[PDB]
Ligand binder design. Structure first.
Ligand SMILES: [Ca+2]
Ligand SMILES: [Cl-]
Length: 108
């Protein structure tokens, strides 16, 4: 019809962590939640950002892919796009959501 005036889903962040047992758990959407030893999945609805820290292990990296693709396929009927980045290669879209990055420790 001519006017759509009655309303009406939110950003989420998942931590992917473990070795023997790799677990995905929801955490606050914030840079403060990120850790260099794990992988994180930032669900923005139409885009999913998959980020692995420099010290993440292979099982976390594999599980992170499974989680990203699971949201894409099971929740977004395959239409959301997945972007893999890592520590230091984050795309501008992540910074728009999460704001300025945590500074690196002096002397890198
Ligand atoms: Ca880890
Ligand atoms: Cl991308």
């Amino acid at each position: 019809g001519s006017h759509h005036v009655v309303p009406n889903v939110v950003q989420r962040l998942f931590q992917v962590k473990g070795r023997r047992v790799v677990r995905a758990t929801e955490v606050p959407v914030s840079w403060e939640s990120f850790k260099n030893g794990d992988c994180f999945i930032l669900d923005l609805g139409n885009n999913i950002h998959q980020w692995c820290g420099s010290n993440s292990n292979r099982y976390e990296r594999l599980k992170a892919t499974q989680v990203s693709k699971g949201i894409r396929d099971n929740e977004r009927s395959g239409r959301a796009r997945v972007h893999v980045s890592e520590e230091g290669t984050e795309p501008e879209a992540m910074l728009q959501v999460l704001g300025p990055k945590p500074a690196l420790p002096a002397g890198t």
